């Protein structure tokens, strides 16, 4: 999609890059 802000995973808090749609640490989806 479009570039936007880094996002904190709501499961583990990790601050993820916006090009990833699942958390780099725990694989939970950004969108739910």
Partner 1 sequence: MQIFVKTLTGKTITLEVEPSDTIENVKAKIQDKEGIPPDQQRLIFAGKQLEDGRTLSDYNIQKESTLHLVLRLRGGD
Cα–Cα distance for residue pair 13/27, rounded to 1 Å = 12
Q: The tokens of 29 are what?
A: 């989806």
Q: Is 21 in the site for Zn ion (CB under 5 A)?
A: no
The least CB distance from residue 8 to partner 1, in Å, is 5
- Number of C-beta neighbours around residue 15 at 10 A: 12
CB 17 within 8 A of CB 8: no
Q: Is 23 in the site for Zn ion (CB under 5 A)?
A: yes
The least CB distance from residue 17 to partner 1, in Å, is 5
Enumerate residues 1-32 that contact partner 1 by CB under 8 A: 1-4, 6, 8, 11-20, 24-26
């Amino acid at each position: 999609g479009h570039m936007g802000a880094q996002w904190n995973c709501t499961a583990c808090t990790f601050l993820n890059h916006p090009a990833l749609i699942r958390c780099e640490q725990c694989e939970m989806p950004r969108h739910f």
